PDB file of C-alpha atoms in Angstrom:
ATOM      1  CA  UNK A   1      -0.202   0.078   0.260  1.00 37.17           C
ATOM      2  CA  UNK A   2       1.057   3.437  -0.462  1.00 37.05           C
ATOM      3  CA  UNK A   3       4.090   5.189  -2.406  1.00 36.30           C
ATOM      4  CA  UNK A   4       7.475   5.649  -1.475  1.00 35.62           C
ATOM      5  CA  UNK A   5       7.916   8.543   0.734  1.00 36.21           C
ATOM      6  CA  UNK A   6      10.987  11.087  -0.593  1.00 32.25           C
ATOM      7  CA  UNK A   7      13.543  10.575   2.017  1.00 32.44           C
ATOM      8  CA  UNK A   8      15.205  14.120   3.313  1.00 33.47           C
ATOM      9  CA  UNK A   9      17.264  15.386   6.087  1.00 32.28           C
ATOM     10  CA  UNK A  10      16.615  19.037   7.299  1.00 33.83           C
ATOM     11  CA  UNK A  11      17.566  20.991  10.605  1.00 36.04           C
ATOM     12  CA  UNK A  12      15.136  22.269  13.274  1.00 32.38           C
ATOM     13  CA  UNK A  13      15.479  25.899  14.793  1.00 33.59           C
ATOM     14  CA  UNK A  14      18.394  24.283  16.784  1.00 34.15           C
ATOM     15  CA  UNK A  15      20.188  22.783  14.009  1.00 32.62           C
ATOM     16  CA  UNK A  16      19.070  19.521  14.902  1.00 30.27           C
ATOM     17  CA  UNK A  17      19.409  17.194  12.130  1.00 35.31           C
ATOM     18  CA  UNK A  18      16.222  14.952  11.454  1.00 39.13           C
ATOM     19  CA  UNK A  19      16.208  12.399   8.616  1.00 38.54           C
ATOM     20  CA  UNK A  20      12.887  11.163   7.467  1.00 39.61           C
ATOM     21  CA  UNK A  21      13.846   7.661   7.209  1.00 39.23           C
ATOM     22  CA  UNK A  22      14.515   7.395  10.981  1.00 40.42           C
ATOM     23  CA  UNK A  23      11.119   7.789  11.784  1.00 43.31           C
ATOM     24  CA  UNK A  24      10.314   4.514  10.149  1.00 42.76           C
ATOM     25  CA  UNK A  25       8.405   2.450  12.576  1.00 41.75           C
ATOM     26  CA  UNK A  26       6.221   5.379  13.534  1.00 39.89           C
ATOM     27  CA  UNK A  27       3.201   6.853  11.860  1.00 41.68           C
ATOM     28  CA  UNK A  28       4.364  10.449  10.517  1.00 37.77           C
ATOM     29  CA  UNK A  29       2.212  13.192  10.047  1.00 34.91           C
ATOM     30  CA  UNK A  30       4.285  15.704   7.598  1.00 33.90           C
ATOM     31  CA  UNK A  31       2.588  19.002   7.320  1.00 37.89           C
ATOM     32  CA  UNK A  32       4.187  22.035   4.993  1.00 38.96           C
ATOM     33  CA  UNK A  33       3.248  25.399   6.187  1.00 34.44           C
ATOM     34  CA  UNK A  34       4.485  28.951   6.574  1.00 33.26           C
ATOM     35  CA  UNK A  35       3.583  31.615   8.861  1.00 31.72           C
ATOM     36  CA  UNK A  36       1.710  33.936   6.914  1.00 30.53           C
ATOM     37  CA  UNK A  37      -0.575  31.022   6.020  1.00 29.82           C
ATOM     38  CA  UNK A  38      -3.854  31.637   7.491  1.00 33.32           C
ATOM     39  CA  UNK A  39      -5.183  28.158   6.483  1.00 30.83           C
ATOM     40  CA  UNK A  40      -1.967  26.906   8.530  1.00 29.70           C
ATOM     41  CA  UNK A  41      -2.528  29.064  11.645  1.00 28.41           C
ATOM     42  CA  UNK A  42      -6.285  27.615  11.909  1.00 25.83           C
ATOM     43  CA  UNK A  43      -5.100  24.096  12.022  1.00 27.86           C
ATOM     44  CA  UNK A  44      -1.604  24.240  14.231  1.00 28.85           C
ATOM     45  CA  UNK A  45      -3.642  24.564  17.959  1.00 26.99           C
ATOM     46  CA  UNK A  46      -5.176  21.349  16.705  1.00 27.07           C
ATOM     47  CA  UNK A  47      -2.259  19.967  15.702  1.00 29.74           C
ATOM     48  CA  UNK A  48      -1.031  20.632  19.011  1.00 31.03           C
ATOM     49  CA  UNK A  49      -3.993  19.079  20.585  1.00 35.56           C
ATOM     50  CA  UNK A  50      -3.844  15.993  19.489  1.00 32.27           C
ATOM     51  CA  UNK A  51       0.095  15.660  19.697  1.00 35.07           C
ATOM     52  CA  UNK A  52      -0.661  15.046  23.510  1.00 38.23           C
ATOM     53  CA  UNK A  53      -2.864  11.741  22.431  1.00 39.05           C
ATOM     54  CA  UNK A  54      -0.608  10.328  20.046  1.00 38.00           C
ATOM     55  CA  UNK A  55       2.840  10.273  20.550  1.00 36.52           C
ATOM     56  CA  UNK A  56       2.219   7.442  23.180  1.00 38.96           C
ATOM     57  CA  UNK A  57       0.593   5.902  20.283  1.00 37.24           C
ATOM     58  CA  UNK A  58       3.603   6.000  18.047  1.00 34.27           C
ATOM     59  CA  UNK A  59       2.896   8.959  15.901  1.00 32.95           C
ATOM     60  CA  UNK A  60       5.203  11.865  15.290  1.00 33.33           C
ATOM     61  CA  UNK A  61       4.445  15.264  13.600  1.00 32.72           C
ATOM     62  CA  UNK A  62       6.766  16.499  11.417  1.00 32.90           C
ATOM     63  CA  UNK A  63       6.075  20.279  10.510  1.00 34.97           C
ATOM     64  CA  UNK A  64       8.195  21.243   7.392  1.00 32.56           C
ATOM     65  CA  UNK A  65       8.292  25.456   7.273  1.00 29.77           C
ATOM     66  CA  UNK A  66       8.489  26.376   3.443  1.00 30.46           C
ATOM     67  CA  UNK A  67      11.887  28.894   3.184  1.00 27.39           C
ATOM     68  CA  UNK A  68      11.482  31.023   6.541  1.00 26.20           C
ATOM     69  CA  UNK A  69      13.963  32.035   9.216  1.00 25.27           C
ATOM     70  CA  UNK A  70      14.928  30.582  12.214  1.00 24.72           C
ATOM     71  CA  UNK A  71      13.734  33.331  14.073  1.00 22.62           C
ATOM     72  CA  UNK A  72      10.487  33.798  12.186  1.00 24.20           C
ATOM     73  CA  UNK A  73       9.628  30.257  12.877  1.00 30.52           C
ATOM     74  CA  UNK A  74      10.532  30.189  16.408  1.00 31.30           C
ATOM     75  CA  UNK A  75       8.398  33.004  16.833  1.00 28.65           C
ATOM     76  CA  UNK A  76       5.639  31.091  15.506  1.00 32.06           C
ATOM     77  CA  UNK A  77       5.937  27.777  17.231  1.00 31.31           C
ATOM     78  CA  UNK A  78       5.960  30.211  20.532  1.00 31.17           C
ATOM     79  CA  UNK A  79       3.001  31.883  19.496  1.00 33.56           C
ATOM     80  CA  UNK A  80       1.003  28.532  18.589  1.00 32.54           C
ATOM     81  CA  UNK A  81       1.846  26.385  21.691  1.00 32.61           C
ATOM     82  CA  UNK A  82       3.776  23.965  19.525  1.00 33.90           C
ATOM     83  CA  UNK A  83       5.467  20.734  21.160  1.00 35.60           C
ATOM     84  CA  UNK A  84       6.189  18.822  18.133  1.00 37.94           C
ATOM     85  CA  UNK A  85       9.112  18.748  15.821  1.00 37.56           C
ATOM     86  CA  UNK A  86       9.142  21.614  13.002  1.00 35.70           C
ATOM     87  CA  UNK A  87      12.153  21.500  10.401  1.00 35.45           C
ATOM     88  CA  UNK A  88      13.582  24.379   7.918  1.00 34.71           C
ATOM     89  CA  UNK A  89      12.985  23.734   4.063  1.00 30.85           C
ATOM     90  CA  UNK A  90      14.869  27.050   3.939  1.00 31.23           C
ATOM     91  CA  UNK A  91      15.710  26.105  -0.164  1.00 33.39           C
ATOM     92  CA  UNK A  92      12.390  24.130  -1.062  1.00 32.15           C
ATOM     93  CA  UNK A  93      14.122  21.307  -2.161  1.00 33.12           C
ATOM     94  CA  UNK A  94      11.737  19.056   0.118  1.00 29.92           C
ATOM     95  CA  UNK A  95       8.564  21.159  -0.853  1.00 27.70           C
ATOM     96  CA  UNK A  96      10.043  20.101  -4.397  1.00 26.94           C
ATOM     97  CA  UNK A  97      10.392  17.078  -3.827  1.00 29.81           C
ATOM     98  CA  UNK A  98       6.899  16.289  -2.314  1.00 29.28           C
ATOM     99  CA  UNK A  99       5.160  18.456  -4.964  1.00 29.33           C
ATOM    100  CA  UNK A 100       3.263  20.417  -2.892  1.00 30.35           C
ATOM    101  CA  UNK A 101       1.972  23.606  -4.090  1.00 30.17           C
ATOM    102  CA  UNK A 102      -0.930  25.064  -2.014  1.00 24.36           C
ATOM    103  CA  UNK A 103      -0.130  25.802   1.777  1.00 23.18           C
ATOM    104  CA  UNK A 104      -0.908  23.689   3.594  1.00 25.61           C
ATOM    105  CA  UNK A 105      -0.505  20.038   2.472  1.00 23.49           C
ATOM    106  CA  UNK A 106       0.019  17.114   4.571  1.00 21.86           C
ATOM    107  CA  UNK A 107       1.319  13.636   4.066  1.00 18.37           C
ATOM    108  CA  UNK A 108       0.629  10.449   6.036  1.00 17.65           C
ATOM    109  CA  UNK A 109       3.017   8.318   6.525  1.00 17.06           C
ATOM    110  CA  UNK A 110       2.797   4.788   7.817  1.00 17.14           C
ATOM    111  CA  UNK A 111       5.048   3.098   9.859  1.00 15.20           C
ATOM    112  CA  UNK A 112       6.630   1.346   6.787  1.00 14.58           C
ATOM    113  CA  UNK A 113       7.553   4.546   5.292  1.00 13.07           C
ATOM    114  CA  UNK A 114       4.773   4.860   2.518  1.00 14.13           C
ATOM    115  CA  UNK A 115       2.515   7.808   1.939  1.00 14.05           C
ATOM    116  CA  UNK A 116      -0.715   6.559   2.275  1.00 14.67           C
ATOM    117  CA  UNK A 117      -3.110   9.685   2.283  1.00  9.60           C
ATOM    118  CA  UNK A 118      -2.678  13.185   1.132  1.00  9.17           C
ATOM    119  CA  UNK A 119      -4.502  15.880   2.510  1.00  9.27           C
ATOM    120  CA  UNK A 120      -4.416  19.455   0.733  1.00  7.38           C
ATOM    121  CA  UNK A 121      -6.224  22.443   2.502  1.00  9.62           C
ATOM    122  CA  UNK A 122      -6.737  23.025   6.110  1.00  9.72           C
ATOM    123  CA  UNK A 123      -8.042  20.445   8.425  1.00 13.25           C
ATOM    124  CA  UNK A 124     -10.403  20.026  11.581  1.00 13.69           C
ATOM    125  CA  UNK A 125      -9.132  18.705  14.704  1.00 14.52           C
ATOM    126  CA  UNK A 126     -11.665  15.620  13.766  1.00 15.18           C
ATOM    127  CA  UNK A 127      -9.858  14.672  10.897  1.00 15.22           C
ATOM    128  CA  UNK A 128      -6.516  15.232  12.108  1.00 15.25           C
ATOM    129  CA  UNK A 129      -7.744  12.717  14.889  1.00 11.37           C
ATOM    130  CA  UNK A 130      -8.909  10.492  12.328  1.00 12.99           C
ATOM    131  CA  UNK A 131      -5.675  10.841  10.365  1.00 14.15           C
ATOM    132  CA  UNK A 132      -3.468   9.908  13.037  1.00 15.05           C
ATOM    133  CA  UNK A 133      -5.356   6.919  13.953  1.00 15.47           C
ATOM    134  CA  UNK A 134      -4.832   5.901  10.217  1.00 14.24           C
ATOM    135  CA  UNK A 135      -1.110   5.738  10.784  1.00 14.78           C
ATOM    136  CA  UNK A 136      -0.378   4.600  14.087  1.00 14.64           C
ATOM    137  CA  UNK A 137       1.595   1.537  14.550  1.00 11.50           C
ATOM    138  CA  UNK A 138       0.584  -0.842  14.532  1.00 11.42           C
TER     139      UNK A 138
END
């Protein structure tokens, strides 16, 4: 099932490198976003609330910021109560690898490392809950 998720290595705002394949065995909620994006701002609180429930079920979020600076991303994270991994796609290489156009776009990656579902546009908390249940191990 699914299609192969392009691997990547990107840094968080503290310079820590995160590699997608290192998250194999967990479900990954891979969300592309920007600080200016209203549909992204609407869903971030929902992601944070649900992350409290799903981390202990083996789901990880990787929120890939599209092109913005460490300070801009730091400020956003603090403003929206972000408790999950955020990485910086500084040169849009990962955006391009995932063929992302509108923001937000989310990829639901199963524990085997395959993309099983794609979602464009903003998501309700109920939708996010369903999506995380879909990819949890196992």
